[PDB]
């Protein structure tokens with residue numbers, strides 16, 4: 121089997137991407153944030169504290185004839201941006217783009233933090249990291265991809281995120297019309313539960329490529345590109361007037377600037393992020409200071425190839441017995 125679903129930016133800055141997901145019988149369609157950096161499929165629900173729901177579409181398990189409460193199971197997660205959610209667990213039928221899994225753990229939120237409440241466009245998350253990170257207790261649950269994998273034509277999914285435009289998540293096949301050139305595959309470590317890999321280096325604009333190993337994670341659930349402070353300083357030094365602002369929490373730059381591209385290495389291959397992908401707009405409405413899309417990972421403890429990097433590529437998440445990651449230009 122295969123599935124294919126369109127993923128759409130939630131706003132004009134590509135702050136996140138939502139993909140429609142059918143849950144239950146009859147289907148309840150929710151728009152979920154597909155997140156290769158986490159491993160829980162959780163949703164706003166009829167159980168979510170009412171004051172914490174502000175415009176999201178909710179899953180109502182009592183209206184799904186295939187929903188079953190998973191006895192005694194709870195979940196609780198916190199993300200690197202400080203956000204969090206928790207609740208109970210159902211199993212139900214979940215379909216993405218025509219691909220159906222029965223008995224998928226659907227984690228129903230009883231509580232969500234304010235940043236989730238304040239984002240009316242995201243109805244929950246669909247985790248696509250390794251199932252070892254799933255938070256359900258006392259019996260850990262499998263991701264949607266892990267449950268689908270054996271049925272897929274090939275044990276893979278691909279991310280093709282758009283810049284200011286829709287894109288696609290495919291499951292079970294590689295669309296050879298969706299990229300240019302070849303796909304370069306690179307080794308993955310699953311030891312931390314992530315799609316963790318090592319980039320071979322970087323260049324800023326038309327500058328010389330610096331060969332240097334950069335270990336990091338392919339994370340569709342993180343908006344920005346988080347890299348070592350030395351790399352990020354080298355990037356922003358090429359933007360007149362850019363500076364790291366402690367009050368804002370990262371590098372900002374004059375909105376009148378034209379940003380240079382940023383290239384990262386995948387083996388001998390090179391993925392070029394156009395400068396415009398790095399502009400995240402005014403720091404507050406009407407400001408002429410703009411937020412940068414490449415930021416230091418120093419406070420985080422891991423480098424993160426988030427949407428800013430991934431949307432410049434066609435990305436293969438190969439879930440074969442030894443997982444690998446593939447990147448192509450597009």
Ligand SMILES: Cc1cn(-c2cc(N)cc(C(F)(F)F)c2)cn1
Pocket residue numbers: 157158199200201337339342343420421422424
């Ligand atoms: C904006 C942002 C994202 N993250 C973050 C994301 C992931 N997937 C994992 C981690 C951790 F540190 F746990 F490895 C951090 C932190 N800040």
